[PDB]
Design a protein around this ligand. Structure first.
Ligand code: HEM
Ligand code: HEM
Ligand SMILES: Cc1cc(N)nc(C[C@H]2CNC[C@H]2NCCNCCc2cccc(F)c2)c1
Ligand SMILES: Cc1cc(N)nc(C[C@H]2CNC[C@H]2NCCNCCc2cccc(F)c2)c1
Ligand SMILES: C[C@H](O)[C@H](O)[C@H]1CNc2nc(N)[nH]c(=O)c2N1
Ligand SMILES: C[C@H](O)[C@H](O)[C@H]1CNc2nc(N)[nH]c(=O)c2N1
Ligand SMILES: [Zn+2]
Lengths: 409, 411
């Protein structure tokens, strides 16, 4: 019932009590652990307990638990559900809901920042053109000329589920992917299917390695439409190395703003299916995953060749050498251009501090070790040595089906 | 029930049916994942089911399920249990059981090797000196002058839990760790407590950075006894770097033979509390953890100093740089001395091949991702991209508490 987690590097032990509030299921059982698995409307009756549970935590957080304003609010929501079959969040509840969805994201190493999130209320939005305007303003505000600020923009909540707002893109800013007659792939292979839906919806693709995708915005369950983010709002960094002069000849660049736009935000049983949110990069996301994944840009082979390393035996660790340098270059490039970026030592150090705060201040912190530990130098970052408990709290961000599997035309 | 695992580099989807034979519990619930927690006397009653299940396993595998010889052996084990309250494994069953414990070890990346395992039966052993002897022969056979061979030596099973065979060292070969007045440590910090004990028992401590510890051996529930492994049996590798000539002057070496000795082997209900086993190192065990953990030898600073890296901001990746070079040195040094070692690229690639084979032949392969993925360069090894399912099969290796915590001293 009361659980301990130990850090094996510091011997510091923490007691978790927050897990007993978890509602949703993990994928695991007593018989099987699904820890490494990437992926393991409401009626009037389902919605009300959800609303109450949420409002209860809200009013407790503002130290007004059991007060007349608490009781009255519970009344008003119940009455709205009974007659309208849904309800509207107050601004204050919405800000709180969003922030706690981030506080609760067990896969996010950057949650020390959870309270500093700028919430843009876009529930008055009605069209795709409106969505586009909200998005460009988010993108510009968050970017802040390279001094990035965390933000989320929240579109209208789901109704009967035939009137969903969706950003089709997986991030507001991503690069196209094209399959070539050559049999290979130019650009980001992670994006082929989506790039094809952009060309099939009308986009003129420049057919480059780094083509910023057009936004595919769906309002009120309507057919999605294309828009191009003003190029001057897309801050990109050319990638160079502080010692290797030849590194820039690789042609590499990345965008400054990581902004996830395909997730579904659940607050008090209400479902916000379009809720693009953004912060700033940890270096490894680009240098390790985007650049070096075999299924991504896959440049290790080419980089190692430029450093003149022995690629005949895996045991020369040429991959590992090239990986370090690629990641040095990413960090250096973002820093030289004054675009906020955090390295994995710094991020994990910070997440450790954040865990300790969440344990004393909340009695816990759901954390997913498989995602928290960076994809390089795992054991030299402190999160490696830290036991974590993983459980699902609400409010939350969740994955949801790609809209094209779902929405018909 | 048919559970699927996806590989996200390759899109290969595998179907697990073998988790259906898992009995032991994982620590996880529908409400909580304990996937990253390190550590989450039997009666007649529970024993025959465990025996029966184990022997059904054995007999199926040799294609004799339901045979007269299978039925006779069930009957004979049955009788032996109600008459003596325990039972004895045939040699063939011990061999088969010890291989399977390794096969079922979900935290072990080395399992493509599982069928090649040298089983030494030390169930006739009765004294600590007997154990010393059996262990030396293990060390020599397994070392094989650098061409390492996998082995396990199996001492008599638990009886009333009052007459346990324990090897008290965590590995047959490890270096001492000495805590100084000033708070520093000399030698391996992880063996401090266990060194203290040895000192206490009578070991005269050399007090250097790589003193190979004595064996502290318990036979038959008796107080444990000190012994020195013959130094000529302890193969070591001095660590140097192919390009960095200053690297040798760091003074580093490691031993060639990793041989876990503190684990409990369970076969068909029986508990072998002394079953030291050995294979050969993946490089990162030494170069990442033993050398570079902050709680271990912690040589990152001193290595990055000597490479003259920019050490004033973590963002130069100076740690990542030094870490790679040290790991290059470890593999270089082993290869040059013809001591078996495997790098983490080759080890993980082999395991994927193993794992795929296991799904195809056996219907699954339980695997602990948190353990399988190497502690450096995670996502450039294919295991990182591999979904895994963790579950508990017997026969099995398990943790047990440390003997000094439980042992009832006689004097
Ligand atoms: C501010 C700096 C931030 C950093 C350094 C950061 C870091 C990360 C990293 C490294 C991941 C792993 C993602 C991957 O590898 O694909 C992640 C996941 C995630 N982050 Fe954060 N994050 C930040 C801000 C935010 C914000 C502002 C939110 C929401 C308000 C958020 C919500 C999430 C969610 C829901 C996931 C899991 C996504 C998934 O499962 O695919 N993050 N984060
Ligand atoms: C032959 C080459 C082998 C290699 C390279 C290898 C590699 C590894 C590695 C890297 C680990 C994780 C250990 C750690 O970081 O603490 C491990 C754990 C383990 N291995 Fe293997 N192994 C090998 C052979 C064997 C053998 C012969 C056995 C027993 C028959 C075995 C049984 C286990 C068990 C039970 C664990 C879990 C240890 C624990 O949970 O603390 N392995 N192995
Ligand atoms: C907000 C924020 C800040 C930050 N630094 N980093 C992030 C993760 C972003 C950026 N870099 C990767 C991307 N990650 C979010 C997308 N994750 C897909 C995971 C996935 C894939 C396939 C099937 C699934 F069920 C799940 C977000
Ligand atoms: C047989 C074999 C071969 C190989 N290559 N590698 C091995 C693992 C060994 C060597 N390098 C580390 C060690 N691993 C086994 C002991 N590890 C500690 C597990 C542990 C720690 C603390 C608390 C616990 F509850 C459990 C075995
Ligand atoms: C199979 C495995 O779950 C998958 O590769 C995970 C592992 N850890 C991860 N961790 C992070 N942060 N991001 C990821 O995309 C992944 N992928
Ligand atoms: C807390 C966490 O589970 C712990 O540090 C684990 C992580 N993965 C590991 N993996 C291996 N192979 N060996 C280890 O000692 C550990 N330690
Ligand atoms: Zn689990």
């Amino acid at each position: 019932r009361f659980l301990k987690v130990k850090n094996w590097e510091t011997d510091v032990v923490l007691t978790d009590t927050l897990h007993l509030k978890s509602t949703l299921e993990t994928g695991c059982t007593e018989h099987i652990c699904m820890g490494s698995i990437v992926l393991p409307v409401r009626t009037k009756d389902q919605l009300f307990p959800l609303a109450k549970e949420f409002l209860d935590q809200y009013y407790s957080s503002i130290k007004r638990f059991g007060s007349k304003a608490h009781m009255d609010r519970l009344e008003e929501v119940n009455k709205e559900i009974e007659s309208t079959s849904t309800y509207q969040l107050k601004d204050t509840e919405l800000i709180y809901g969003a922030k706690h969805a981030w506080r609760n994201a067990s896969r996010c190493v950057g949650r020390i920042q959870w309270s500093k999130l700028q919430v843009f209320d876009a529930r008055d939005c009605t069209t795709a053109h409106g969505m586009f305007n909200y998005i460009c303003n988010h993108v510009k505000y968050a970017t802040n000329k390279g001094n990035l600020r965390s933000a989320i923009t929240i579109f209208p909540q789901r109704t009967d589920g035939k009137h969903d707002f969706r950003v089709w893109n997986s991030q507001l800013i991503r690069y196209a992917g094209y399959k070539q007659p050559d049999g290979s792939t130019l650009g980001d292979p992670a994006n082929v299917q989506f790039t094809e839906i952009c060309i099939q919806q009308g986009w003129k693709a420049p057919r480059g390695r780094f083509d910023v995708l057009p936004l595919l915005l769906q309002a009120n369950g309507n057919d999605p439409e294309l828009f191009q983010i003003p190029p001057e709002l897309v801050l990109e960094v050319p990638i160079r190395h502080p010692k290797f002069d030849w590194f820039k000849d690789l042609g590499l660049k990345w965008y400054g703003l990581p902004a996830v736009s395909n997730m579904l935000l659940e607050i008090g049983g209400l479902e916000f299916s379009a809720c693009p949110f953004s912060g700033w990069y940890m270096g490894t996301e680009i240098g390790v995953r985007n650049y070096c994944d075999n299924s991504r840009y896959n440049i290790l082979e080419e980089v190692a060749k430029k450093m003149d390393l022995d690629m005949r035996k895996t045991s020369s660790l040429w991959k590992d050498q090239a990986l370090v340098e690629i990641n040095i270059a990413v960090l250096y490039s973002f820093q030289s251009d004054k675009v906020t970026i955090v390295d994995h030592h710094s991020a994990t150090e910070s997440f450790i501090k954040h865990m300790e705060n969440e344990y004393r201040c909340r009695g816990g912190c759901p954390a997913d070790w498989v995602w928290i530990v960076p994809p390089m130098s795992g054991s030299i970052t402190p999160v490696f040595h830290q036991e974590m408990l993983n459980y699902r709290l609400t409010p939350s961000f969740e994955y949801q089906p790609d809209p094209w599997n779902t929405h018909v035309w």
